[PDB]
Amino acid sequence: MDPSMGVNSVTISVEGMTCNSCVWTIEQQIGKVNGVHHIKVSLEEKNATIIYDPKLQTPKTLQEAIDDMGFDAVIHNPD
Ligand SMILES: [Cu+]
């Protein structure tokens, strides 16, 4: 019904985080950063893609939440 009635998705390329602590620290950070209806990070697939509310948030906080955690982030969705 509402997989994303009023939200958007963003995929961030990541690197240098091939250790559990990067998926539980980026999933816990992005997942609870603001409104992440679904967050998918993968220390081995080297990417972090999630969904967020573009009405109150945007891919700048997802880039600030990945930049805040400490992992090379190269989002390839809007740009
Ligand atoms: Cu780690």
Q: What is the 3-state secondary structure (H, E, C) of 2-68?
A: CCCCCCEEEEEEEECCCCCHHHHHHHHHHHCCCCCCEEEEECCCCEEEEEECCCCCCCCCHHHHHHH
Ligand 1 centroid–CA 63 distance in Å is 18
Rounded to the nearest angstrom, the distance between the alpha carbon of 42 and the centre of ligand 1 is 11
Give me ligand 1 centre to Cα 16, in Å.
8
18 annotated ligand-binding residue: yes
The class level of CATH for 1-79 reads: alpha beta
Tell me if 22 is assigned to a ligand binding site. Answer: yes
* Domains of the chain by residue range: 1-79
* DSSP-assigned letter for residue 73: E
Q: Identify the DSSP state of 77.
A: S
Tell me which method was used to determine the 3D structure: NMR
